[PDB]
Design an enzyme around this catalytic site. Structure first.
Site, mmCIF file in Angstrom:
data_model
loop_
_atom_site.group_PDB
_atom_site.id
_atom_site.type_symbol
_atom_site.label_atom_id
_atom_site.label_comp_id
_atom_site.label_asym_id
_atom_site.label_seq_id
_atom_site.Cartn_x
_atom_site.Cartn_y
_atom_site.Cartn_z
ATOM 1 N N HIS A 107 0.845 -1.206 0.000
ATOM 2 C CA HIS A 107 0.000 0.000 0.000
ATOM 3 C C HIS A 107 0.874 1.248 0.000
ATOM 4 O O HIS A 107 0.528 2.250 -0.620
ATOM 5 C CB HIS A 107 -0.951 -0.007 1.192
ATOM 6 C CG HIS A 107 -1.859 -1.193 1.212
ATOM 7 N ND1 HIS A 107 -1.889 -2.094 2.255
ATOM 8 C CD2 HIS A 107 -2.749 -1.647 0.297
ATOM 9 C CE1 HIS A 107 -2.758 -3.052 1.982
ATOM 10 N NE2 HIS A 107 -3.293 -2.803 0.800
ATOM 11 N N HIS B 85 4.973 7.146 7.050
ATOM 12 C CA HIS B 85 4.829 6.649 5.685
ATOM 13 C C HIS B 85 4.468 7.835 4.823
ATOM 14 O O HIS B 85 4.193 8.926 5.330
ATOM 15 C CB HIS B 85 3.712 5.605 5.594
ATOM 16 C CG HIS B 85 2.375 6.116 6.039
ATOM 17 N ND1 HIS B 85 1.921 6.059 7.337
ATOM 18 C CD2 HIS B 85 1.391 6.730 5.335
ATOM 19 C CE1 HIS B 85 0.707 6.629 7.383
ATOM 20 N NE2 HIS B 85 0.333 7.057 6.193
ATOM 21 N N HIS C 30 2.371 9.221 1.002
ATOM 22 C CA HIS C 30 1.325 9.042 0.012
ATOM 23 C C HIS C 30 1.906 9.889 -1.136
ATOM 24 O O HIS C 30 2.478 10.954 -0.884
ATOM 25 C CB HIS C 30 -0.007 9.623 0.523
ATOM 26 C CG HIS C 30 -0.550 8.914 1.728
ATOM 27 N ND1 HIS C 30 -1.314 7.772 1.681
ATOM 28 C CD2 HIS C 30 -0.412 9.200 3.045
ATOM 29 C CE1 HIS C 30 -1.610 7.420 2.941
ATOM 30 N NE2 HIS C 30 -1.087 8.254 3.820
ATOM 31 N N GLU D 280 -2.873 13.960 0.369
ATOM 32 C CA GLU D 280 -4.243 13.598 0.695
ATOM 33 C C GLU D 280 -5.023 14.850 1.082
ATOM 34 O O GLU D 280 -6.097 15.100 0.560
ATOM 35 C CB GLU D 280 -4.245 12.547 1.804
ATOM 36 C CG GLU D 280 -3.423 11.329 1.434
ATOM 37 C CD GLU D 280 -3.863 10.078 2.137
ATOM 38 O OE1 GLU D 280 -3.679 9.982 3.369
ATOM 39 O OE2 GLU D 280 -4.393 9.191 1.440
ATOM 40 N N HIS E 194 3.110 11.238 6.754
ATOM 41 C CA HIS E 194 2.320 11.032 7.968
ATOM 42 C C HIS E 194 3.166 10.391 9.041
ATOM 43 O O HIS E 194 3.636 9.260 8.858
ATOM 44 C CB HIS E 194 1.122 10.114 7.721
ATOM 45 C CG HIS E 194 0.111 10.686 6.789
ATOM 46 N ND1 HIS E 194 -0.768 9.888 6.099
ATOM 47 C CD2 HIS E 194 -0.061 11.981 6.416
ATOM 48 C CE1 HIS E 194 -1.447 10.712 5.331
ATOM 49 N NE2 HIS E 194 -1.047 11.986 5.490
ATOM 50 N N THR F 299 -6.736 7.420 6.864
ATOM 51 C CA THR F 299 -7.104 7.602 5.459
ATOM 52 C C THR F 299 -7.097 6.310 4.628
ATOM 53 O O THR F 299 -7.198 6.362 3.397
ATOM 54 C CB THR F 299 -6.218 8.631 4.764
ATOM 55 O OG1 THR F 299 -4.873 8.137 4.716
ATOM 56 C CG2 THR F 299 -6.278 9.967 5.494
ATOM 57 N N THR F 300 -6.894 5.172 5.289
ATOM 58 C CA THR F 300 -6.919 3.875 4.622
ATOM 59 C C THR F 300 -7.722 2.908 5.528
ATOM 60 O O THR F 300 -7.920 3.181 6.734
ATOM 61 C CB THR F 300 -5.469 3.295 4.361
ATOM 62 O OG1 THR F 300 -4.895 2.848 5.582
ATOM 63 C CG2 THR F 300 -4.544 4.333 3.783
HETATM 64 N N1 LIG Z 1 -2.391 7.207 6.383
HETATM 65 S S1 LIG Z 1 -2.723 7.281 7.821
HETATM 66 O O1 LIG Z 1 -1.864 8.174 8.449
HETATM 67 O O2 LIG Z 1 -4.044 7.723 7.959
HETATM 68 C C1 LIG Z 1 -2.580 5.845 8.551
HETATM 69 C C2 LIG Z 1 -3.069 4.605 7.982
HETATM 70 C C3 LIG Z 1 -2.781 3.498 8.833
HETATM 71 C C4 LIG Z 1 -2.074 3.947 10.039
HETATM 72 S S2 LIG Z 1 -1.934 5.471 9.897
HETATM 73 S S3 LIG Z 1 -1.664 2.942 11.125
HETATM 74 O O3 LIG Z 1 -0.321 3.174 11.501
HETATM 75 O O4 LIG Z 1 -2.420 3.172 12.294
HETATM 76 N N2 LIG Z 1 -1.901 1.454 10.900
HETATM 77 C C5 LIG Z 1 -0.584 0.779 10.885
HETATM 78 C C6 LIG Z 1 0.177 0.617 9.631
HETATM 79 C C7 LIG Z 1 1.512 -0.039 9.563
HETATM 80 C C8 LIG Z 1 1.969 -0.499 10.903
HETATM 81 C C9 LIG Z 1 1.264 -0.373 12.202
HETATM 82 O O5 LIG Z 1 1.790 -0.902 13.553
HETATM 83 C C10 LIG Z 1 -0.009 0.283 12.101
HETATM 84 C C11 LIG Z 1 -2.651 0.929 9.659
HETATM 85 C C12 LIG Z 1 -2.868 -0.582 9.531
HETATM 86 N N3 LIG Z 1 -3.383 -0.734 11.070
HETATM 87 C C13 LIG Z 1 -3.702 -2.207 11.467
HETATM 88 C C14 LIG Z 1 -4.163 -2.278 12.965
HETATM 89 O O6 LIG Z 1 -5.413 -1.360 13.231
HETATM 90 C C15 LIG Z 1 -5.237 0.077 12.717
HETATM 91 C C16 LIG Z 1 -4.687 0.176 11.298
HETATM 92 C C17 LIG Z 1 -3.057 2.074 8.671
HETATM 93 ZN ZN LIG Z 2 -0.980 8.019 5.594
#
Ligand SMILES: NS(=O)(=O)c1cc2c(s1)S(=O)(=O)N(c1cccc(O)c1)C(CN1CCOCC1)=C2
Ligand SMILES: [Zn+2]
Ligand SMILES: [Hg+2]
Length: 258
Positions: free
Chosen positions: A62, A92, A94, A104, A117, A196-197
């Site tokens: 992603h 990360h 985008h 975004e 982010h 946002t995902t």
């Molecule tokens: N683009 S964002 O800032 O809006 C974020 C999207 C996601 C974030 S922040 S995140 O860091 O919180 N999280 C994430 C991503 C990669 C590693 C991790 O420990 C967490 C996941 C996947 N996550 C699985 C468990 O429940 C919540 C969502 C997606």
């Molecule tokens: Zn993000």
């Protein structure tokens, strides 16, 4: 089959599995500078990234993520519109397939080339998984990337992308300093939102920085060479992994500056 950013499993389809996509406090949104309320009571942001321990970098299909050791208060975010301490867990980006899209959040309908982010979680909750169950569980610091001159602090990240080209690959990424990714000024806008995902959880306090950072086109160019697919599968370039701006609904964006 599983969410993505393409024709068939993109943002427009997300609501089928994740009903919260049509909720009240979804992100990202468009920041209209003339409607944002100056609020003199907001505190200045306090970013303590002086003992941050980065562990690794991985391609998750992603985007790519740099993970940190959040076992204790080594890297924190306080002040601004927050209550209590939030721990840095990962950052990360985008980005787009072209320089005029990627971010975004938008400013006055303006799209930047990419968006950083820096994700933090509220310590009063114990662990990340608990924090995602609360309204004020997360604090994501967002920074806009504008194409211009190179950012020294980003080169380390750029150099390692070749070893995490396809889905599921990782590389050890220790001793990385996040303070190198910050702009000069810490002025911001703030509003209550969500991830946002998928799962699109509404647990985020968004702090968008006013001042964007400069990144060379060669640096961003290397982002676009990553793959959504895993090894052995057909190649699909990782670009345009961003969600469209959502309706603000009954919310107000406060500015910490005039
Ligand atoms: N683009 S964002 O800032 O809006 C974020 C999207 C996601 C974030 S922040 S995140 O860091 O919180 N999280 C994430 C991503 C990669 C590693 C991790 O420990 C967490 C996941 C996947 N996550 C699985 C468990 O429940 C919540 C969502 C997606
Ligand atoms: Zn993000
Ligand atoms: Hg939540």
């Amino acid at each position: 089959h599983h969410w993505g950013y393409g024709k068939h499993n993109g943002p427009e389809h997300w609501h089928k599995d994740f009903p919260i996509a049509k909720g009240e406090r979804q992100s990202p949104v468009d920041i209209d500078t003339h409607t944002a309320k100056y609020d003199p009571s907001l505190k200045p942001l306090s970013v303590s990234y002086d003992q941050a321990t980065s562990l690794r970098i991985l391609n998750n299909g992603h985007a790519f993520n740099v993970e940190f050791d959040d076992s204790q208060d080594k890297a924190v975010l306080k002040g601004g519109p927050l209550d209590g301490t939030y721990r840095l867990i990962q950052f990360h980006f985008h980005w787009g397939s072209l320089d005029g899209q990627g971010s975004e959040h938008t400013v006055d309908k303006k799209k930047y080339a990419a968006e950083l982010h820096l994700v933090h979680w509220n310590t009063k909750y114990g662990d990340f998984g608990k924090a995602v169950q609360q309204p004020d569980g997360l604090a994501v610091l967002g920074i806009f990337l504008k194409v211009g001159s190179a950012k020294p602090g980003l080169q380390k990240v750029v150099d390692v992308l070749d070893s995490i080209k396809t889905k599921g690959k990782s590389a050890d990424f220790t001793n990385f300093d996040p303070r190198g990714l910050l702009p000069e000024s810490l002025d911001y806008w703030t509003y209550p939102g969500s991830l946002t995902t998928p799962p699109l959880l509404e647990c985020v306090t968004w702090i968008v920085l006013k001042e964007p950072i400069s990144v060379s086109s060669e640096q961003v160019l290397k982002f676009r060479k990553l793959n959504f697919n895993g090894e052995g599968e057909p190649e699909e370039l990782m670009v345009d992994n961003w969600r469209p701006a959502q309706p603000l609904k009954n919310r107000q964006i406060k500015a910490s500056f005039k």
